[PDB]
mmCIF file of C-alpha atoms and ligand atoms in Angstrom:
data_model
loop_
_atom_site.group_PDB
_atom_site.id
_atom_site.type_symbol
_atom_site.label_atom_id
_atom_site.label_comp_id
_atom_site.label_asym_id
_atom_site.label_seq_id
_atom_site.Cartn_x
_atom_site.Cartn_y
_atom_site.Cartn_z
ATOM 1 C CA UNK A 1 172.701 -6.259 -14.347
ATOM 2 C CA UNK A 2 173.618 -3.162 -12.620
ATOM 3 C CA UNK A 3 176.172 -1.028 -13.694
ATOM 4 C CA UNK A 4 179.128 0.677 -11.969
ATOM 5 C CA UNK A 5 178.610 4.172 -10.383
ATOM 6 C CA UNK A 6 180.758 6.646 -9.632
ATOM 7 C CA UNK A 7 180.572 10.528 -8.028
ATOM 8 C CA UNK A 8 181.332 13.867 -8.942
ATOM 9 C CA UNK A 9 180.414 17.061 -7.637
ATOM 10 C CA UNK A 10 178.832 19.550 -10.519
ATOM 11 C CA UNK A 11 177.028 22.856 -10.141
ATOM 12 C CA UNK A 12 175.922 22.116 -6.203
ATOM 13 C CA UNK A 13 175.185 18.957 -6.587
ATOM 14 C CA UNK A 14 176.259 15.123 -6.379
ATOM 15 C CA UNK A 15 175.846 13.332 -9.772
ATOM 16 C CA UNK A 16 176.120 9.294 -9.647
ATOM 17 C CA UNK A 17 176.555 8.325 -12.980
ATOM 18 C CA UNK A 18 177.769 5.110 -15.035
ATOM 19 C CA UNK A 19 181.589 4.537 -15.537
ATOM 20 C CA UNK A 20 180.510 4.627 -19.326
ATOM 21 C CA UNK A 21 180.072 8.361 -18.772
ATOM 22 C CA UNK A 22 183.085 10.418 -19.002
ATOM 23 C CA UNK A 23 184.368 13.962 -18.622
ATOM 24 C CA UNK A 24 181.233 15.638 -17.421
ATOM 25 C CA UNK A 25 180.832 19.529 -17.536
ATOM 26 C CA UNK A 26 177.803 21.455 -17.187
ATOM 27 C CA UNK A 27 176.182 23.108 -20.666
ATOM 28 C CA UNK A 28 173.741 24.926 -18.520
ATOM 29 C CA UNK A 29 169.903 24.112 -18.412
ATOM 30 C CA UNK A 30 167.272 22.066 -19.111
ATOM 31 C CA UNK A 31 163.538 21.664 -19.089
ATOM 32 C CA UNK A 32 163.312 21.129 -15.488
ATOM 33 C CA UNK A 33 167.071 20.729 -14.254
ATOM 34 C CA UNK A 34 170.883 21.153 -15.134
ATOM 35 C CA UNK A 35 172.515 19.396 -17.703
ATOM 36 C CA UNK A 36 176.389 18.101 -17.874
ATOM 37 C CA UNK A 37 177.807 17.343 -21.081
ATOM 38 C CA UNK A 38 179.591 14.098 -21.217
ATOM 39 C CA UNK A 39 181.868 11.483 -23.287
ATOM 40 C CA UNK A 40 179.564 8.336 -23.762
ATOM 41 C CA UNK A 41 182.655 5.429 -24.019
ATOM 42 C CA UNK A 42 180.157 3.257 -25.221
ATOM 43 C CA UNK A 43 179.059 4.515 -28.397
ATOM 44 C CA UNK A 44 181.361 7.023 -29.126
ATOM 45 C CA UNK A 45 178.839 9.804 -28.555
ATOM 46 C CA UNK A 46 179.083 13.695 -27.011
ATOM 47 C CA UNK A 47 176.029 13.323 -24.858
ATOM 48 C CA UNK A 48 173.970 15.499 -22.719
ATOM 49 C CA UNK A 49 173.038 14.311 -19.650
ATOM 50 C CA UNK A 50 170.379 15.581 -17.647
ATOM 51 C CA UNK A 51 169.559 15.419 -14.035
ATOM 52 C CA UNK A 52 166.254 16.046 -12.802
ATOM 53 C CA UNK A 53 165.992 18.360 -9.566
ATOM 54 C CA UNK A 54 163.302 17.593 -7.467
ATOM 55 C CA UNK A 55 161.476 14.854 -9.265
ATOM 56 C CA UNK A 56 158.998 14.073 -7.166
ATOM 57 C CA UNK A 57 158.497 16.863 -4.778
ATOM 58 C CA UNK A 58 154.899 17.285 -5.993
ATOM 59 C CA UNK A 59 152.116 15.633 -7.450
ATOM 60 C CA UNK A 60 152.792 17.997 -10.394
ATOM 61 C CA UNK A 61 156.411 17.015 -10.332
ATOM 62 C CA UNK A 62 156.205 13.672 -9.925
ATOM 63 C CA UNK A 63 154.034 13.871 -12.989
ATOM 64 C CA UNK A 64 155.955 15.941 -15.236
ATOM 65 C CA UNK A 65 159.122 13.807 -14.342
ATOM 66 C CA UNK A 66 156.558 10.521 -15.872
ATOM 67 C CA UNK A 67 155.590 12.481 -18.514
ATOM 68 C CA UNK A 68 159.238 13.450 -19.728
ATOM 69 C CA UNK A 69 160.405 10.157 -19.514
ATOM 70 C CA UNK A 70 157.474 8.502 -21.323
ATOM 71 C CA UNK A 71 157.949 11.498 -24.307
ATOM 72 C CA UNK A 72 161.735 10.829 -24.653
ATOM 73 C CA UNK A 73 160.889 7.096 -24.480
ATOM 74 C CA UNK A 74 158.886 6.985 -27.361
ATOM 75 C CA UNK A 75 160.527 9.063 -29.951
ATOM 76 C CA UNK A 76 162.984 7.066 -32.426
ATOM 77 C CA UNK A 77 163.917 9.473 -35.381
ATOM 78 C CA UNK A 78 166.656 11.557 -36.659
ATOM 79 C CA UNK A 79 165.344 15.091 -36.268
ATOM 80 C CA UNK A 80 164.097 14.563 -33.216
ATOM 81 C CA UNK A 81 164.808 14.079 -29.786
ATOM 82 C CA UNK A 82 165.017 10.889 -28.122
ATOM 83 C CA UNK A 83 166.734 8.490 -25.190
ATOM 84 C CA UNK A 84 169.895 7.071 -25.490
ATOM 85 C CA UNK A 85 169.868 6.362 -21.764
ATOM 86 C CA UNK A 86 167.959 6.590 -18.571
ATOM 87 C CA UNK A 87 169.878 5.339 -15.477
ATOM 88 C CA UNK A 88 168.643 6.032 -11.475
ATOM 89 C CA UNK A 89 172.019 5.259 -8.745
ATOM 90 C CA UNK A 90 168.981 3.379 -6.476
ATOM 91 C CA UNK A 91 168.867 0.189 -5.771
ATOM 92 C CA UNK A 92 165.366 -0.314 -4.874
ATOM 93 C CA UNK A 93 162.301 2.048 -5.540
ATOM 94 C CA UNK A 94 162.652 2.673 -1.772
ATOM 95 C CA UNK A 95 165.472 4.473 -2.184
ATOM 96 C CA UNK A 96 164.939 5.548 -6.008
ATOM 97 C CA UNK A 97 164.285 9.635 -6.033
ATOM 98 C CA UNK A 98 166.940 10.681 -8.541
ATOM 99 C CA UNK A 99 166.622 10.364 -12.447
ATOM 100 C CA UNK A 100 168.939 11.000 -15.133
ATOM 101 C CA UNK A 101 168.102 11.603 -18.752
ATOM 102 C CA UNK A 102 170.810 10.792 -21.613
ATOM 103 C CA UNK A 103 170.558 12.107 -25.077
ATOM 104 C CA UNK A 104 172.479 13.347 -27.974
ATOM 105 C CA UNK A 105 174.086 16.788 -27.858
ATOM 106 C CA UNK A 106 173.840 18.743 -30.708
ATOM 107 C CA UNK A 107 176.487 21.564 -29.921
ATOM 108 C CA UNK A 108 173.950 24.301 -30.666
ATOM 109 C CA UNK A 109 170.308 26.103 -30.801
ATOM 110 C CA UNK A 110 169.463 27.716 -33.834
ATOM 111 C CA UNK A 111 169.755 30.764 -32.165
ATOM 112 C CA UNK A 112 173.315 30.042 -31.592
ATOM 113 C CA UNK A 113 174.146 29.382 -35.691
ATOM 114 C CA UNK A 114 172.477 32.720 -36.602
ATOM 115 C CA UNK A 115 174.741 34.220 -34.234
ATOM 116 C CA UNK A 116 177.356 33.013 -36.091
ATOM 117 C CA UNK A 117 176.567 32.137 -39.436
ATOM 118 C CA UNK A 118 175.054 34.138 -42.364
ATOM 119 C CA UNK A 119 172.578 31.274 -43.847
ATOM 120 C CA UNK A 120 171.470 30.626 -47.491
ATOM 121 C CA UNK A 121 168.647 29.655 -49.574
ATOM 122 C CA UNK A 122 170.021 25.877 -48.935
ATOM 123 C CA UNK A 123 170.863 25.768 -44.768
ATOM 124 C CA UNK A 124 167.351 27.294 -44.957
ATOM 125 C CA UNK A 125 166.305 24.571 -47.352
ATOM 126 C CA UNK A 126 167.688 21.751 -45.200
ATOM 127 C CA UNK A 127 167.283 23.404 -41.657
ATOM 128 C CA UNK A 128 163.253 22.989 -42.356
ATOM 129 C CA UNK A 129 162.913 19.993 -44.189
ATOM 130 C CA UNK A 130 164.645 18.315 -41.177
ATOM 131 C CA UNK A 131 161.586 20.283 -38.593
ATOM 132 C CA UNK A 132 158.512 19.196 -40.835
ATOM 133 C CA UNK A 133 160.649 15.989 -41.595
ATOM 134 C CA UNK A 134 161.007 15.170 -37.035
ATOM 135 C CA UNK A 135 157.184 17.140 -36.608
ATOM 136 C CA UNK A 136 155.544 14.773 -39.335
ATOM 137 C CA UNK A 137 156.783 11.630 -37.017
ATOM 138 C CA UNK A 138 155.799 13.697 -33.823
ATOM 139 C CA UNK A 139 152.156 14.402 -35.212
ATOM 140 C CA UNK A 140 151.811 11.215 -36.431
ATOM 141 C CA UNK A 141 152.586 9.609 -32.318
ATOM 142 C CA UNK A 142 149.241 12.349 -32.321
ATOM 143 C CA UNK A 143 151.685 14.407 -29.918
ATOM 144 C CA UNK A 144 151.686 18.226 -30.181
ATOM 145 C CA UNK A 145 155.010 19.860 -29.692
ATOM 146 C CA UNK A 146 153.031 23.669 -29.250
ATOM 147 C CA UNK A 147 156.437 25.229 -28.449
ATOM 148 C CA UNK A 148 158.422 25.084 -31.396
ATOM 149 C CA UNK A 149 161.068 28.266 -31.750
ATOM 150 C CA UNK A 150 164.445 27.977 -32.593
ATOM 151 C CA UNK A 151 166.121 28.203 -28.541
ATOM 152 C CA UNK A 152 163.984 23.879 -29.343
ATOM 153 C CA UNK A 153 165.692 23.264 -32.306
ATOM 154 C CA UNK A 154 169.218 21.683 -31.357
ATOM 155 C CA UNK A 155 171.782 21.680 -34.498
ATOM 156 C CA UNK A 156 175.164 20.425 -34.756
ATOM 157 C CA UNK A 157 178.157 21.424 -37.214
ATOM 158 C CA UNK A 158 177.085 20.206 -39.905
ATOM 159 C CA UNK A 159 173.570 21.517 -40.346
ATOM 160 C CA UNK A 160 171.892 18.349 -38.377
ATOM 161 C CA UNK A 161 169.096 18.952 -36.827
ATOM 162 C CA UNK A 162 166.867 17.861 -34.064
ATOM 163 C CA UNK A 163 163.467 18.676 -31.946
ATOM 164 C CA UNK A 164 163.492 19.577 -28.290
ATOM 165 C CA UNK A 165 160.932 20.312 -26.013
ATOM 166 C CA UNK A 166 157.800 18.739 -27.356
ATOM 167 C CA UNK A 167 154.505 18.175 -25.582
ATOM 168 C CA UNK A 168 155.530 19.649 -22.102
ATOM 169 C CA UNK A 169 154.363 23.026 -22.905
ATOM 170 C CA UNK A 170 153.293 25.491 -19.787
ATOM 171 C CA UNK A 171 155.354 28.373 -20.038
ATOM 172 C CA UNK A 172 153.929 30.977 -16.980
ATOM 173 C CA UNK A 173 152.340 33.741 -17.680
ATOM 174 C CA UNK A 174 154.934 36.224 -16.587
ATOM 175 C CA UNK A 175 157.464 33.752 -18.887
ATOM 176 C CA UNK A 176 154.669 35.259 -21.784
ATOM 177 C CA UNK A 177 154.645 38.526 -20.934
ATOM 178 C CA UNK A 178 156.023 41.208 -22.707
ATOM 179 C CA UNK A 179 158.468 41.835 -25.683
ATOM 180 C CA UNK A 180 159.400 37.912 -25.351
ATOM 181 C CA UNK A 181 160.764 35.183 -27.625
ATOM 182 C CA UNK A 182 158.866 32.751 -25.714
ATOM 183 C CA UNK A 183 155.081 33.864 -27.638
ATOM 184 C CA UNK A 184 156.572 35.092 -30.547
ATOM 185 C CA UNK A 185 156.701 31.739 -32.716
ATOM 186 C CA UNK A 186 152.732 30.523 -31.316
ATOM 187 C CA UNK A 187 149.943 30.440 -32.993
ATOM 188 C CA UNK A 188 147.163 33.282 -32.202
ATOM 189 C CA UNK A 189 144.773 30.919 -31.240
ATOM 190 C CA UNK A 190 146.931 29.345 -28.330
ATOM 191 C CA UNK A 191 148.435 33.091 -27.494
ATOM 192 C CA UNK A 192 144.390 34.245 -26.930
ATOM 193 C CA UNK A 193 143.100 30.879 -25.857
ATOM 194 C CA UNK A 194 140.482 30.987 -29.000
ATOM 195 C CA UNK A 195 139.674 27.392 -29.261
ATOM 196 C CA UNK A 196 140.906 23.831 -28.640
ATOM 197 C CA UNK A 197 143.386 23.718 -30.853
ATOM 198 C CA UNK A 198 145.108 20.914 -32.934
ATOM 199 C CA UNK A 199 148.733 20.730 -34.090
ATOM 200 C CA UNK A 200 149.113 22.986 -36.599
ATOM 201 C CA UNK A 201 149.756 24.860 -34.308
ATOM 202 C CA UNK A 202 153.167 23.795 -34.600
ATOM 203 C CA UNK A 203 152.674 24.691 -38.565
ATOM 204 C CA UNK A 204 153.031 28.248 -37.522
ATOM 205 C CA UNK A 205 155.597 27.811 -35.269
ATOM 206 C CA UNK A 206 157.663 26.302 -38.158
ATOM 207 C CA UNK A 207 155.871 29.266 -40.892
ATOM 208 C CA UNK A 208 157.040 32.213 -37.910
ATOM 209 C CA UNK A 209 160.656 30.356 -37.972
ATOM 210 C CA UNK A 210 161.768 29.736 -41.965
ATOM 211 C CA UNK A 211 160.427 33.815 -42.021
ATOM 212 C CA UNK A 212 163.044 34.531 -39.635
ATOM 213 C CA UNK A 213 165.535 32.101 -41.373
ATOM 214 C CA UNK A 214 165.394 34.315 -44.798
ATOM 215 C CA UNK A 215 165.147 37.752 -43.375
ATOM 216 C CA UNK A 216 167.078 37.861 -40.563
ATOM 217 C CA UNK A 217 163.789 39.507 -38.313
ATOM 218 C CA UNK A 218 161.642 38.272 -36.195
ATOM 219 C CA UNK A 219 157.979 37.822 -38.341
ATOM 220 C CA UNK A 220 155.897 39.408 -35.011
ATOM 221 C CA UNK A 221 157.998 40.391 -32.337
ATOM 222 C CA UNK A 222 154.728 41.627 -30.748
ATOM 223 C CA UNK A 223 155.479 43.675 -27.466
ATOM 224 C CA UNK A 224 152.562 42.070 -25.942
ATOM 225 C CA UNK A 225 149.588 39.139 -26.923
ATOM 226 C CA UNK A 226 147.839 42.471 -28.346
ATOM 227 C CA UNK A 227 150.261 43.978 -29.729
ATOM 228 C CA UNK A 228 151.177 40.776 -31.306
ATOM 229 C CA UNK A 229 147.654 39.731 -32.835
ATOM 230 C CA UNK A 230 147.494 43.222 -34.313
ATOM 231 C CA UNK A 231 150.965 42.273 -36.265
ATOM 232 C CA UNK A 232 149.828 38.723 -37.286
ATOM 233 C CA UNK A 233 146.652 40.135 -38.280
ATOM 234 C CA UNK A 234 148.008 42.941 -40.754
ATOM 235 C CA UNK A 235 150.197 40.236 -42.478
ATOM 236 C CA UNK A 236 147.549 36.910 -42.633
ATOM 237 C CA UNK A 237 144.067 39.565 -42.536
ATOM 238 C CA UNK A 238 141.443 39.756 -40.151
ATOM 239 C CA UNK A 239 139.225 36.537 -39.753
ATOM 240 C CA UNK A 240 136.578 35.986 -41.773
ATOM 241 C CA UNK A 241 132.911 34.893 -40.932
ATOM 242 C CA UNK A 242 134.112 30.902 -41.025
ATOM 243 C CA UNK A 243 136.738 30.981 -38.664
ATOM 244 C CA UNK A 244 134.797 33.416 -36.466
ATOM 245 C CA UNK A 245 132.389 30.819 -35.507
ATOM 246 C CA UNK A 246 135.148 28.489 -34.895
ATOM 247 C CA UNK A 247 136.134 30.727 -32.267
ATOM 248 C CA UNK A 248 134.683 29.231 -28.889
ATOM 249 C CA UNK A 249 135.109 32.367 -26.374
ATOM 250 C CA UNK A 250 132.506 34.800 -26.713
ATOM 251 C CA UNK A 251 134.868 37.760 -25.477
ATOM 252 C CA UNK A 252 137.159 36.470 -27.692
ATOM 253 C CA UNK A 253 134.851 37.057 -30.908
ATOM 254 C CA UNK A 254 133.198 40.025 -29.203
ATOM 255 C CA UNK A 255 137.096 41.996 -29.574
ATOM 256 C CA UNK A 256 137.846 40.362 -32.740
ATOM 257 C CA UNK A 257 134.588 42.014 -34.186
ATOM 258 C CA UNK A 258 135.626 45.639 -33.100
ATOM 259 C CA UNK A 259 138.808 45.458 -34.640
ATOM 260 C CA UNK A 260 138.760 47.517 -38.175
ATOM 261 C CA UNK A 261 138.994 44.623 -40.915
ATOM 262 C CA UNK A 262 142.324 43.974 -42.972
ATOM 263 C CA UNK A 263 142.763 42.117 -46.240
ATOM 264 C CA UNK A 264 145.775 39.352 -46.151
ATOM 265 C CA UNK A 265 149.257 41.242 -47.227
ATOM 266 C CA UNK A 266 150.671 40.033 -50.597
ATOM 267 C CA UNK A 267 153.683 37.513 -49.323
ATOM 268 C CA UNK A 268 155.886 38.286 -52.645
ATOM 269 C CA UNK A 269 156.013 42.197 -51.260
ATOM 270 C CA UNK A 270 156.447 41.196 -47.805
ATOM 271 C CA UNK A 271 159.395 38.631 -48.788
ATOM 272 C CA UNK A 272 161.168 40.199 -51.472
ATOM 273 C CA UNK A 273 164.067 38.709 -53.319
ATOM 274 C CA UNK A 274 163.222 35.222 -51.611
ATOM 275 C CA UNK A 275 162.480 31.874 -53.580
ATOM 276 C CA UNK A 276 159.153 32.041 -55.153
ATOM 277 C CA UNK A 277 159.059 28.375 -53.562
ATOM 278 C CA UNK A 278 159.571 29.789 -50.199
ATOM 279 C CA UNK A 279 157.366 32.213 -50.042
ATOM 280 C CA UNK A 280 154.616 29.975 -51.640
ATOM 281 C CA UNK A 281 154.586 27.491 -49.127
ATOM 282 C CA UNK A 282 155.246 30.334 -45.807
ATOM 283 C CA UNK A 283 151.648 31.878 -47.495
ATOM 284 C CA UNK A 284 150.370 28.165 -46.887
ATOM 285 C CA UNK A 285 151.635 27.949 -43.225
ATOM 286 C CA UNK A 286 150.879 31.351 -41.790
ATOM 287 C CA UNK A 287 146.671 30.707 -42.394
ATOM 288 C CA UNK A 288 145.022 32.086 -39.908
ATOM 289 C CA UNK A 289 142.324 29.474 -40.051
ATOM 290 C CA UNK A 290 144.125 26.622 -38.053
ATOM 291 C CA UNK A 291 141.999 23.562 -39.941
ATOM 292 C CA UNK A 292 143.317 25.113 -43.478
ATOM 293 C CA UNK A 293 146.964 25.197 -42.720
ATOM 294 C CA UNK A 294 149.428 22.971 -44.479
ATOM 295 C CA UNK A 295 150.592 19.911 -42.081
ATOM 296 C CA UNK A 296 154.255 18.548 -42.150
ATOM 297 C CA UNK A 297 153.211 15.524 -44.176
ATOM 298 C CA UNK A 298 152.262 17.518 -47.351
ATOM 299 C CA UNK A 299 154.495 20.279 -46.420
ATOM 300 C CA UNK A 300 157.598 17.445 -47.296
ATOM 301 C CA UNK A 301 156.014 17.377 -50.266
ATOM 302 C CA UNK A 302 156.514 20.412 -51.539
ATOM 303 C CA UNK A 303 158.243 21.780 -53.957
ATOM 304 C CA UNK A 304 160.266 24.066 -52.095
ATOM 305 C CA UNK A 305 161.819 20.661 -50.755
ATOM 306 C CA UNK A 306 162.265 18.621 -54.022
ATOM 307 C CA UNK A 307 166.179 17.952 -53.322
ATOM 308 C CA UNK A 308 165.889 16.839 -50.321
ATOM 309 C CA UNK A 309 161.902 14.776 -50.002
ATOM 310 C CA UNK A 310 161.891 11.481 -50.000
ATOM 311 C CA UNK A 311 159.050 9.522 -49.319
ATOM 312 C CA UNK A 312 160.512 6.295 -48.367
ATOM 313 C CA UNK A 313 162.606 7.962 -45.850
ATOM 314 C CA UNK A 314 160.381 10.017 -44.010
ATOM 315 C CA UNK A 315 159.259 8.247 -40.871
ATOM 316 C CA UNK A 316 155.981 7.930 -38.660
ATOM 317 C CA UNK A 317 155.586 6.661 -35.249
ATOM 318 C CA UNK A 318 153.621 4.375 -33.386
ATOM 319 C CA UNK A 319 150.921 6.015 -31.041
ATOM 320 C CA UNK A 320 151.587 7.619 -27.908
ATOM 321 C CA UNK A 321 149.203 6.588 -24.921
ATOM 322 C CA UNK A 322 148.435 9.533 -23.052
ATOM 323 C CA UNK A 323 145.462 8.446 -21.156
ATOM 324 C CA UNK A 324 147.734 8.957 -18.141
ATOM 325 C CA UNK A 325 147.492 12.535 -18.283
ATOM 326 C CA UNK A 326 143.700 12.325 -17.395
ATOM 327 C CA UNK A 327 144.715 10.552 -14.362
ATOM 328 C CA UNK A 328 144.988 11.327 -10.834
ATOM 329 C CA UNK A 329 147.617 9.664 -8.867
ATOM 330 C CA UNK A 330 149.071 10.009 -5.465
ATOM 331 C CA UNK A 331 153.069 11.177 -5.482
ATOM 332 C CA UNK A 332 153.973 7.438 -4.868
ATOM 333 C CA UNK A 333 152.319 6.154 -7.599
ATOM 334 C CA UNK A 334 153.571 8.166 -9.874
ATOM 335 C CA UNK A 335 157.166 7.568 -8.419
ATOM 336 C CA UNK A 336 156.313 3.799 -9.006
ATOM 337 C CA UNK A 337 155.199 4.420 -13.076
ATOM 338 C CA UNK A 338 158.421 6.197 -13.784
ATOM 339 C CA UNK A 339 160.784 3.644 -11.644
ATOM 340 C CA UNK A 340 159.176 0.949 -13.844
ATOM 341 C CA UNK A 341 159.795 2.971 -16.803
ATOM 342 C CA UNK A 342 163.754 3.489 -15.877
ATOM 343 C CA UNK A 343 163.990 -0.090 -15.065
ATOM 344 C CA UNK A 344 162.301 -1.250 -18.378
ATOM 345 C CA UNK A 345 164.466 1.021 -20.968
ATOM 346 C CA UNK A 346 166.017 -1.099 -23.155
ATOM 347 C CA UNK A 347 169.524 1.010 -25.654
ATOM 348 C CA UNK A 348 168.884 1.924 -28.812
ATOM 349 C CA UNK A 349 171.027 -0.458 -31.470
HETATM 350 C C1 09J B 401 171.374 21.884 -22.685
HETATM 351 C C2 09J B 401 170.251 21.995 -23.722
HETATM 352 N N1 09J B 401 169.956 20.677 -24.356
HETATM 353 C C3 09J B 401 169.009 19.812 -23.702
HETATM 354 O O1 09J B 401 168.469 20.158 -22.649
HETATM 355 C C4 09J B 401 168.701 18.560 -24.243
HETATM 356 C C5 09J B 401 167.761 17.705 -23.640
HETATM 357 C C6 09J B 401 166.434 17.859 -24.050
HETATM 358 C C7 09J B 401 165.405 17.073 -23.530
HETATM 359 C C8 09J B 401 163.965 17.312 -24.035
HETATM 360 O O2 09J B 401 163.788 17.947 -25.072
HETATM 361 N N2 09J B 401 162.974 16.799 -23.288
HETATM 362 C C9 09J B 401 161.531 16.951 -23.601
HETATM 363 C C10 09J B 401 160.678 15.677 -23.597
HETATM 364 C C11 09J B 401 161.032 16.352 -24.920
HETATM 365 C C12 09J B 401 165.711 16.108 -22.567
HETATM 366 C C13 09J B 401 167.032 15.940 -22.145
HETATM 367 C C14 09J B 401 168.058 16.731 -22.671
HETATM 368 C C15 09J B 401 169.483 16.499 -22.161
HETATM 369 C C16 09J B 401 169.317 18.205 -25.440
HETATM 370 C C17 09J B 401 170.223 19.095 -26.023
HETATM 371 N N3 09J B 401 170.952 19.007 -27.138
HETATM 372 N N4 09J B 401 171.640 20.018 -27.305
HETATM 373 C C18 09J B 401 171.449 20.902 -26.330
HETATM 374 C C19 09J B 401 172.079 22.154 -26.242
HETATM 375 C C20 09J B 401 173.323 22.280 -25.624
HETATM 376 F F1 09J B 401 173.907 21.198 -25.088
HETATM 377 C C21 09J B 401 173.959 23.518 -25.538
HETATM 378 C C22 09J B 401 173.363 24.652 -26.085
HETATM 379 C C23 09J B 401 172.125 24.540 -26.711
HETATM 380 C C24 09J B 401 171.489 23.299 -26.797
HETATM 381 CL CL1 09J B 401 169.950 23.226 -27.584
HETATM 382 N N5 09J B 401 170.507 20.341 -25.428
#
């Protein structure tokens, strides 16, 4: 059962969208095209409603485009994410080379409510209770988000909050260059390449973000990857002789030994006036050691989160097959896989 299309020229483009769809007007951009805001008459939902540009202009588009829709597919939780709709104008996968993404809109960034809004001790409580709460369902699909900051964290008016962006990743290099947001919140050993890393990652993402949340500054706002290391490593210390080994790249070992060594900052002089809570668990996220840093799952349990943890209400997922990514497909065929997946998508209740 098809439903009924209609047209309407935004930005400098056609969309083709459902009649449910109503009062479209563009919000700007997304991860790989523009994005219209939208009445759903459906379920009573301001939506955001993306349409991909060229979706299959490449093998690496075409495959991206999969991979987007497969990630959005599978996530079903509050604080993160997820698909309320996918809907193609084709026909036929003959004719089937435009895809459009529906989700929630969250009227914000976090970014945005900083702007505007002086936060306490609480909006910080609740703001990252609801990350670890959406990253502890993400980890457990064994998905790495590796670009959490807050421009990924969408929030609404009343301090709800959800994940963006995860498991896409490849920012350019000249998108990481510089005295740039985009490197800021990432982990040094993804910044320097220093290993294959795991997601905890993301645990420093989220440790570099509630910093910024109860000072007001950015934790290392490094004008470069050097400059930035050298700030992350007068705050966390210089590695020791464990993690050294751990370290894969034999440049990358070869500078860390020159640098002069530096004992780990006290966090209580570096944070003053914040909850002792706070600034307990931030010491347990910013490790420099990757393996030895807190993950979301015990993180909820904390004690800096006691008002709002609850362990019966604090999701997981089901796996997330990514064995496609290790697979080489023609543009076609990858066209084909994400028709199927459009075809297949069945509303959330
Ligand atoms: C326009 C920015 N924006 C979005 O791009 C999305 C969005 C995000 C994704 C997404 O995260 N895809 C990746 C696979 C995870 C997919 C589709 C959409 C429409 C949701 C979303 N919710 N709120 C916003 C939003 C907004 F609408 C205006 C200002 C700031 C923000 Cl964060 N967005």
């Amino acid at each position: 059962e098809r439903p009924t299309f209609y047209r309407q020229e935004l930005n400098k483009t056609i969309w083709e969208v459902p009649e449910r769809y109503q009062n479209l007007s563009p919000v700007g951009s997304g991860a790989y095209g523009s994005v219209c805001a939208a009445f759903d008459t459906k379920t009573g939902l301001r939506v955001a409603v993306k349409k991909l540009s060229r979706p299959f202009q490449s093998i690496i588009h075409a495959k991206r485009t999969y991979r987007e829709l497969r990630l959005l597919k599978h996530m079903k939780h509050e604080n993160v994410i997820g698909l309320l709709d996918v809907f193609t104008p084709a026909r036929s996968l003959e004719e089937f080379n435009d895809v459009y993404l529906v989700t929630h809109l969250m009227g914000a960034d976090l970014n945005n409510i900083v702007k505007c809004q002086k936060l306490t001790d609480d909006h910080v409580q609740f703001l990252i209770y609801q990350i670890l709460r959406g990253l502890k369902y993400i980890h457990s699909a064994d998905i790495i988000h590796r670009d959490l900051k807050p421009s990924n964290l969408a929030v609404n008016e009343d301090c709800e909050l959800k994940i963006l962006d995860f498991g896409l990743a490849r920012h350019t290099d000249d998108e990481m260059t510089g005295y740039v947001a985009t490197r800021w919140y990432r982990a040094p050993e993804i910044m320097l390449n220093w290993m294959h890393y795991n997601q905890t990652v993301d645990i420093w993402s989220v440790g570099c973000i509630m910093a910024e949340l109860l000072t007001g500054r950015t934790l290392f706002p490094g004008t470069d990857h050097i400059d930035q290391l050298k700030l992350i490593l007068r705050l966390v210390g210089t590695p020791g002789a464990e993690l050294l080994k751990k370290i894969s790249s034999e440049s990358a070992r070869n500078y860390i030994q020159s640098l002069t060594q530096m004992p780990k900052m006290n966090f209580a002089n570096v944070f003053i006036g914040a909850n002792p809570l706070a600034v307990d668990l931030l010491e347990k996220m910013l490790v420099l050691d990757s393996d030895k840093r807190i993950t979301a799952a015990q993180a909820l349990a904390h004690a800096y989160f006691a008002q709002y943890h609850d362990p019966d209400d604090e999701p997981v997922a089901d796996p997330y097959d990514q064995s496609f990514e290790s697979r080489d497909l023609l543009i076609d065929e990858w066209k084909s896989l994400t028709y199927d997946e459009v075809i297949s998508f069945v509303p959330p209740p």
